[PDB]
Amino acid sequence: FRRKDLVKTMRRVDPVYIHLAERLGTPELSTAERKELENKLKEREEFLIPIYHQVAVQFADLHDTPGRMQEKG
Amino acid sequence: LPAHTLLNTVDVELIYEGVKYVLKVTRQSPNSYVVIMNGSCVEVDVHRLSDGGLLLSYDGSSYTTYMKEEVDRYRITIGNKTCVFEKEEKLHRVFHYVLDNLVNVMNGYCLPDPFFSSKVKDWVERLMKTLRDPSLPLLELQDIMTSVSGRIPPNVEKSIKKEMAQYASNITSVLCQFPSQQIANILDSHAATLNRKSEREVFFMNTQSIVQLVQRYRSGIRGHMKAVVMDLLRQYLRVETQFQNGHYDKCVFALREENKSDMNTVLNYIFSHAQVTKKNLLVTMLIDQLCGRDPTLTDELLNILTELTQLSKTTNAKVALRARQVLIASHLPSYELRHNQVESIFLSAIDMYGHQFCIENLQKLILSETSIFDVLPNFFYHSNQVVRMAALEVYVRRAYIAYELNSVQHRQLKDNTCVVEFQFMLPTSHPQRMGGMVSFRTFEDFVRIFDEVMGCEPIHILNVAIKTDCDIEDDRLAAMFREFTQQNKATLVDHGIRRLTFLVAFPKFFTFRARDKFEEDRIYRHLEPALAFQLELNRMRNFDLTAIPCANHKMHLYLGAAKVEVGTEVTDYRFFVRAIIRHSDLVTKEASFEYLQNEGERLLLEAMDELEVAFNNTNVRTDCNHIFLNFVPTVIMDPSKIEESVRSMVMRYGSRLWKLRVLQAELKINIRAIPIRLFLTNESGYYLDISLYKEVTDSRTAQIMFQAYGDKQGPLHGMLINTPYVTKDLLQSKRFQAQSLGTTYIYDIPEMFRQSLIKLW
């Protein structure tokens, strides 16, 4: 889980990031609107890092369990 | 316990007077036993006796038998004799017979492996033929009515008698269906009257068999036929839906917890699951007879298919895949619509042309996206002999869509040979062309007046269509035409004809170039010479292509061998699939997903089958197999929904595409029309990388450019439109990767070893 995978995961969870990214990807809006949405997206991307880092750590923690060591033998 | 110990077959070895007999014993039911002896099967009706013996029916005669087990002997008593072995028909009885046998197969009671499927196919075929026979419900009606002569009011009995008499007298005739509704009507009318005091109870009780019969045949003989097989598929799902959504232990434990009061139910589930492979063979055979040559599905069949295709457990893949095929197969044209419409337009214009509607009909035929080349080659005369020219103009005008056609002329020879001449050009490609087309009968008029019909740089294009409506046999037709083109070289010495196209009347195209090269073309066969651009096959510039023959010649599979110098050999081999989807433009009312999904999925499955056969039958070690699907018709749909559709379509078979080394795919779809290109990378079947681009034609040249949608521009952003491929595929790509890390490539170890020994010496 590098930064780009955390952002890819944010792309499908965070409502604010989803709203901004769906708007920026919409054609025929304007130049200034796209620039503003891009800067807000960068701000959310760098802002949200700690929580999704914790989430990814939990995700990796889930596959270290004794249940898997039992299933594999 | 695992589901391979609860077995229904026993091997028994009995030695009699030195001769060892190895017998297999299994069952078709709790009481129906099958014994394999000396390679032959015998069916025995076996009933358990309370005294430990068995009651057998073997050859029509009954036997009461016992066994005693000794230290090294089996003492079999039959009647009053001992053998010591050493230890080392009316059409409605057939319905029940075969249906009970098939249900027994569905419940896990199957014949032995060397004998299974030898009789089940016949049970399925006989069930189908019996159910489709109109006289079956008459026999059921006769049987239920004869066993109840009284206790039925005379009015309803007489009405039923009259209706069944009519139906019997109309057997096997158009406009005839079983009168289930009329029997229901008279019974419901008498019930509506509702006579009291023993007219009520007796009537309502003693007519239930007739109500059941009309309920079974409420949808007719064909509906009943379909319903029975649907019931068998429901019996399949009844068991197999319990072994999904988890592991075997989860299923068995959950079944134990749900059925605490009875453990035999759990055992039945496990037992029937043990023989799921044989059940799957029967399920495939049952599906073939339910939704085969009938491209339509009801809202009851669709539920069974939708549940069946969701059996994600791999052991049932055979039944899921075929079910998926049905869901896509029953949304195709039946060729009757195109044949009737095109033939009506072509024949009705001939009597007197220029009524200001037949012109528009021919224009609609030319300007439509739907293929009509399965109907056009059959217009040789049909009766009228003018339709020749009407066909000859349309086909060319339908095929030559990328050409600027400026003149068409009709000419005839002093025979029954019509020819149409065309003059056209390429606006921005290969910088004036001409051509013409003629039709003949059976073979001879082609060669007899070949030089005369030709009288319309080698810019000329000559097409010929001949009426040989029999037996798609590429070699025979190609030899028949090639034998002439190998002797008559008028195509080169007259004025210069670039290519001669041979159209066999569905259409089979054999292109020949009798100018310099051998008169054969394995690469562009079965393609129109005018629509040979509309395959994206010229992109294989760096490959020597070998075409792979296959059945159903709408799919085009090629094996490209990368071009290399006279030194190093070819290491990069790749299978390329090129298919075209032909259909009219769609009108989106939230109902355009079915066309794209079904056509793409059908071509994808056919491509995978042909790739499997081609790949396993050779040894060339391909790496990156590629599939391209051209969606001709225009569709109004947001590209994100097309992304979702192709994501589902590809991910559901990602495991097969991974096994077949299919790594890249390209889908071209015309939106609203502006084409978009979906570039898919499909590695191991967990994730699919879809990149979306539009074709940008807003340039000062004929050059087209890819433009992305902002999100994930990717490698194709700014890529032109049409680029060749090739790579090194191994051995001069891993060497570099290893050198980049400060170590040698592993297969360099022996050579250094040899060289080191030299220094050692």
Curated annotation (Swiss-Prot), chain A:
It is linked to Acetyl-CoA carboxylase-alpha deficiency: An autosomal recessive inborn error of de novo fatty acid synthesis associated with severe brain damage, persistent myopathy and poor growth. Cytosolic enzyme that catalyzes the carboxylation of acetyl-CoA to malonyl-CoA, the first and rate-limiting step of de novo fatty acid biosynthesis. This is a 2 steps reaction starting with the ATP-dependent carboxylation of the biotin carried by the biotin carboxyl carrier (BCC) domain followed by the transfer of the carboxyl group from carboxylated biotin to acetyl-CoA. The gene is ACACA. The biotin cofactor is covalently attached to the central biotinyl-binding domain and is required for the catalytic activity. CoA binds at residue 2. The modification Phosphothreonine is found at residue 26. It is found in: Cytoplasm, Cytosol. This is Acetyl-CoA carboxylase 1. The chain holds residues 2128 to 2200 of 2346 of the full protein. Consists of an N-terminal biotin carboxylation/carboxylase (BC) domain that catalyzes the ATP-dependent transient carboxylation of the biotin covalently attached to the central biotinyl-binding/biotin carboxyl carrier (BCC) domain. The C-terminal carboxyl transferase (CT) domain catalyzes the transfer of the carboxyl group from carboxylated biotin to acetyl-CoA to produce malonyl-CoA. Signal peptide: none annotated. Expressed in brain, placenta, skeletal muscle, renal, pancreatic and adipose tissues; expressed at low level in pulmonary tissue; not detected in the liver.
